[PDB]
RNA sequence: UAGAUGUUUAAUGUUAAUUAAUUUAUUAUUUUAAUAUUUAAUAUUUGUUUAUACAAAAGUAACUUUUUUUGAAUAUAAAG
């Protein structure tokens, strides 16, 4: 079956940015988007655990660092 | 029956000098601010399918532990 990971190594880009292209764009990088807020995690009730989504979808999380890379550029590239 | 020729309330009423049966004459038709109806078997709601771009101001009902830079400090989501 066709995997994104074993494409990739066609493509030699990496794993976390061909995902990055079937996800939102706020999934990713550093745009404008609300996700619901029943993601945004709970406190610890007396009976229920606590809540966190960057442990309930570590898969959406801003790759902060891919942001870097492509749509921002550095202070060191125009001194 | 009943005073009288008809529109300025009667009260020691658990003596505001009391302590176990007060069984308290007490209420403004409407201008008040709270509730309850009636319209109401209602009007409106009803989620099985479309073609994706990035800023800022804008919020902060909000969380974060997890890789901001190789800049020290600072800050990275959410309307009107």
């Known amino acids: 079956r066709f995997?994104?990971?074993?494409?990739?190594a066609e493509l030699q880009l990496d794993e976390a940015y061909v995902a990055s292209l079937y996800k939102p764009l706020h999934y990713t990088y550093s745009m404008k988007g609300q996700r619901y807020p029943a993601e945004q995690g709970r406190?610890?009730?007396?009976?229920?655990?606590?809540?966190?989504?960057?442990?309930?979808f570590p898969l959406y999380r801003r790759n902060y660092k891919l942001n870097r890379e492509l749509r921002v550029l550095d202070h060191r590239r125009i001194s």
């Open 3 to 8: 995997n994104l990971d074993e494409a990739a």
């Open 43 to 56: 406190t610890s009730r007396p009976g229920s655990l606590a809540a966190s989504r960057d442990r309930m």
